[PDB]
Amino acid sequence: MQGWGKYFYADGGVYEGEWVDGRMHGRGTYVFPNGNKYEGEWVEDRKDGYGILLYTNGERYEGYWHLDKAHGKGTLTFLQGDRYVGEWHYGKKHGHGVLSYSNGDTYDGEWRDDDAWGYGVLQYANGCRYEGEWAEDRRHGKGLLVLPDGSSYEGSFAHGKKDGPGKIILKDGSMYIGTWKDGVIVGQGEFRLSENC
Amino acid sequence: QGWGKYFYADGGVYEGEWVDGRMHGRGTYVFPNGNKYEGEWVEDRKDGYGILLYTNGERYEGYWHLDKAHGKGTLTFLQGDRYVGEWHYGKKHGHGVLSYSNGDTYDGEWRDDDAWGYGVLQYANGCRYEGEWAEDRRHGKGLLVLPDGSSYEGSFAHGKKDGPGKIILKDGSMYIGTWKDGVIVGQGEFRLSENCDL
Ligand SMILES: [Cl-]
Ligand SMILES: [Cl-]
Ligand SMILES: [Cl-]
Ligand SMILES: [Cl-]
Ligand SMILES: [Cl-]
């Protein structure tokens, strides 16, 4: 099973490409029973190296594979509108990458196991903008959130909501210092105004 | 009855109309003080219109009753302070405006020579207080506007912020809480004018 050739039909899946020893090896294409079609490099019956897989619904990945999963630098385009360009780790967004959301949001930062995780900045379509840490695809740890007004909160976050100590600075110049828990003010706080009189 | 001048042993002088041996009618009296009164008299008392000029500088011009300021009258002070309003037997009482030399000027109610009731005070530092007063001090519900453009409205006690109140800024974002002796106390809530996501 050497040279070029065509083969398979596990279902109706036809692989056509290079071969070694009954394993697909080299560049080749494979239209799978789904209708998904991978066209790239192979290493011993798994996609390994660069390759493009078109999904039947519309999706389209472009990048490096390893052991039949996305691994390395790769671009995932949702022709609905989404677009991701960055590092992968065995099928999941992992490392650094940017994502353009359909709703208008844009992310730039770290990822771990297909989730925003680590440092990253997200420019919301509504005008807010977050610059801080993440955990499990939600704002977690210290961060800075600017609001389309121009005022901002800087403090701690937990599970996507304001939580812990924090300061909120106003355009006016005034400040409120207090503690949050699950996105809500409670406890003793301090509020400084810009002008005394 | 009639007119004539008199020199008391005190050094005081009176000349003007008399009735039954009592100063009554128009007359002028310069006191041993150096104070000189010039107005209407009734039975040896300032009563009706009159001016009283003090040797130190002050000058009352208005109506008198039972030898005391009573009715509408203007008093200008040592410092330059000018009161224009109603009097009640020597005390600011009713409605009156006081313009202090420091620049502040008050316009509101009075009771027993004290700011008491509703009144507006424009501070010289650019501020304005519109609220109630008790015993010459900001007391009750009031609105305090800062030159900032923000404003505090809530309650006052003995001249300081005290009780529930709201600071509302130029943005429309507001802080809601309670005060004790002009300083923040208790738990508060801060609301933003504009926020994320909604
Ligand atoms: Cl989040
Ligand atoms: Cl939140
Ligand atoms: Cl501003
Ligand atoms: Cl006061
Ligand atoms: Cl105060």
Residue numbers in the entry:
A (entry chain B): 155 to 351
B (entry chain A): 156 to 353
Can you list sentences taken from the study reporting this PDB entry?
High-resolution crystal structures and biophysical analyses of a truncated form of the TbMORN1 protein and its homologues from the parasites Toxoplasma gondii (TgMORN1) and Plasmodium falciparum (PfMORN1) enabled, for the first time, a structure-based definition of the MORN repeat. All three structures are antiparallel dimers joined via their C-termini, and, when possessed of the correct key residues, can adopt extended or V-shaped quaternary structures.
The structures of TgMORN1(7–15) and both P21 and C2 crystal forms of TbMORN1(7–15) were subsequently determined to 2.90, 2.35 and 2.53 Å resolution, respectively, with the PfMORN1(7–15) structure used as a search model for the molecular replacement. TbMORN1(7–15) formed an extended antiparallel dimer in both crystal lattices, while TgMORN1(7–15) adopted this architecture in one crystal form. The tightest overlap between the two subunits occurs through MORN repeats 14 and 15. A series of hydrophobic and aromatic π-stacking interactions between residues from repeats 14 and 15, together with hydrogen bonds across the edges, stabilise the dimer. In the P21 and C2 TbMORN1(7–15) crystal forms, the dimer interfaces occupy surface areas of 747 Å2 and 966 Å2, respectively. Calculations of gain in solvation free energy (ΔiG) upon dimer formation for TbMORN1(7–15) C2 and P21 performed with the PDBePISA package yielded values of -20.1 kcal/mol and -11.3 kcal/mol, respectively, with corresponding p-values of interface specificity 0.01 and 0.08. In the C2 crystal form, the dimer is additionally stabilised by two disulphide bridges formed between Cys351 at the C-terminus of repeat 15 and Cys282 from the β-hairpin loop of repeat 12.
